[model samples]
Target: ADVAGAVIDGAGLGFDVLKTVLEALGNVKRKIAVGIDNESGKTWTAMNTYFRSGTSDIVLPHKVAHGKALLYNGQKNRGPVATGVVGVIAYSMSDGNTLAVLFSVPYDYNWYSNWWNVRVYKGQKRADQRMYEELYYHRSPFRGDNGWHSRGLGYGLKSRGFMNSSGHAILEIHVTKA
Candidate 1:
């Protein structure tokens, strides 16, 4: 399992990408593997990534061409690991729209649950702390339902994906033209 610490730019979706993200976790008890496909007919340039909890050393803000996908990941810290990667990533689309994704995996299973969210803004935006708040707190997130959730994201694009509900999670999302 070879996980490149650098960002994986403009690659297609496959098990290789999945493996890359998984490997990045480095055997953490709680982690996430994320693979997002960009089929929206527009290129995506990584704007930023924000982490609220957990830990990761992987590089982010990578670019993804149209018809390609991006692979990124995160994990919980070793000592007293209490939470998994809880964060949001933002990308600027060629058409001036912004694509944002959120993943929340809490270590305290008794009081928390895994969730994911995907939203498209009408303008260019960065994935900063503010953006993370809006996506994680304001937006209606999906509760790792163990099945694909599809929705119209406006701007001629739609998103469909599945995010598992567990400590070690798997999130696969596809953004395509509506």
Candidate 2:
């Protein structure tokens, strides 16, 4: 048990609020072992608003945790993470908008690719009070889908939301269990 902290008061919270929570959790390794998933949709009033309140500031700073990858040039350059474990990354899009990147998966530094699918917060695309929150889960994001109990966030270098104008901010992280 690397993390011990206060009970989460809400099922959904903003990024900064969550960051402070982790700060107290003894994540000297910078690994995010806890999060308030909004899968239930029974607690929060608006997910969009919670995701868009972010400013163009780096809350977690930029670093290569776990040697997985680095957010750069709108492409995932593997073998380029900072030394040690990674959990949370905060940065601004080249367009001068703030965004956050959280990791909940096994980052494979040995892998190489032109596209990566780690979670993304799109400040540039914030419209209608919603930014593109492209986090990951092991199971399908469906209510009735099976394997729901084992659901958790993960890191991947996929091409799910690769938009030309979505963002220029870069970030990569690797979470560990061993």
In terms of TM-score, the best-performing candidate is 1
| Tens digit of per-residue lDDT, candidate 1, span 31-107 | 88887888899988887777888666767636777876677778876787466678888888899889999999888
Clashes of each: 0, 12
Best candidate according to lDDT: 1
State, as a TM-score between 0 and 1, how close model 2 is to the true structure: 0.23
Candidate 2 lDDT over 53-151, as tens digits, reads 122112221322222222211112224453322222343333333333332222333441112222323344332322223422331222211112222
Report lDDT (Cα) of residue 131, candidate 2: 22
In angstroms, the error of model 2 at 142 is 12
Model 1 ranges off by over 4 Å: 1-20
